[PDB]
Design a protein around this ligand. Sequence first.
Ligand SMILES: Nc1ncnc2c1ncn2[C@@H]1O[C@H](COP(=O)(O)OP(=O)(O)O)[C@@H](O)[C@H]1O
Ligand code: ALF
Ligand SMILES: [Mg+2]
Length: 437
Amino acid sequence: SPPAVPQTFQVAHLHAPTGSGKSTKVPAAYAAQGYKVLVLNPSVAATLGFGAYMSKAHGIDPNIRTGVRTITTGAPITYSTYGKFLADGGCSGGAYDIIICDECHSTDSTTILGIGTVLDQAETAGARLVVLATATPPGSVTVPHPNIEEVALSSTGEIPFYGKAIPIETIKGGRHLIFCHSKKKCDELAAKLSGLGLNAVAYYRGLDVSVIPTSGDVIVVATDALMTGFTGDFDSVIDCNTCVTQTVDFSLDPTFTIETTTVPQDAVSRSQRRGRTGRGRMGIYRFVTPGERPSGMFDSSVLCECYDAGCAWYELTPAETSVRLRAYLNTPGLPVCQDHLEFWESVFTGLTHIDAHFLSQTKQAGDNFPYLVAYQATVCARAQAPPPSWDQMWKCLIRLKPTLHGPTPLLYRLGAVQNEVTTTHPITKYIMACMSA
DNA sequence: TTTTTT
Ligand SMILES: Nc1ncnc2c1ncn2[C@@H]1O[C@H](COP(=O)(O)OP(=O)(O)O)[C@@H](O)[C@H]1O
Ligand code: ALF
Ligand SMILES: [Mg+2]
């Protein structure tokens, strides 16, 4: 039996290995007790996947809510992504008795902001139980899984893979999942395997979950868009053991810089990726490297991304997002980070009167910090000055050069700077004061 | 050079 439901609001932690049944069995047990359950996951493929399965294996077609697709059935169970949950208004888009926060170990801004939202509104919203579920709580390390056998890759094999090689034999038939660190890498591999006579398909953000055949032989080459909560019935998993990290650097040149670099995977990633196999049956995990870095903490850039997301996506004021983030930090058992809430709130509080047209173009482009990018562009346009550079990031200005001249009013560094720079603009000064003190 | 939101 799952974490019992208390009379009044309470927060509980649920730790169980990957494939245990936290996302299906648990909520199914709550529903059977007559409770309305809301399950939040960071992944789109995962959210969508629960639908067909819960129906066939637990006799209940649940509601599915994702940015791209939604399925309303009126059932007592609802599965949604943190993103769609926020976009729907948080704890105001429905009244549930139980809210399960899956993959609560995640350190992506969307999940952070999501969980912070529920921990701040759940009680008042009438929720009596909030469950923080995960197979890899902060501080934990990868341990042996009862359904998974691990076999290291070697220099033997006809398919080059991050230094090592992949024997065709291990993937000739059956169903297998290969994790790559980049999107182009997936397309490269998928193509190569297809040219070898194998049925391979690439998968990542944006692609339809249907590209993954529900049955039959197949080799899915994907990114971390298929790292958690997903069950593709894979006979094995091949891990490149490489991740893409993003950190903020207070370089005072003139302000801060957000750099995205490829680094070796941590413990969270290793267990979750490995966990995509051996789900309800035996499985095999092949890797390139045995080591794994620690987990349980996240960079300050993530906080920055939350405020940016709150402004550009969720119509949240910097102060409002601070109320939600505070709730997250005040909750034990969750990933920790430097308490810079006030610093970031003050920075975004100063970025006023952004150009709507520019924002709607940065969001469409799917940038990491749409708001910051759009604001930098707003300051340039309103200064008759050119952007930091001319790469895709600043395409919203490309059709304006005839009027853009002089130095760029650099507010911060989102990418490479190739034009002349000025650090005397009021906004730049403002941000500097938020840093120095 | 990853994912999630109109
Ligand atoms: N979409 C699915 N298709 C087939 N089997 C599934 C599916 N989803 C879940 N299962 C089965 O139920 C088990 C529990 O899945 P799940 O609740 O998602 O695990 P957890 O949340 O603990 O990672 C899995 O081991 C798997 O065998
Ligand atoms: F939630 Al899991 F494997 F732990 F999908
Ligand atoms: Mg799960």
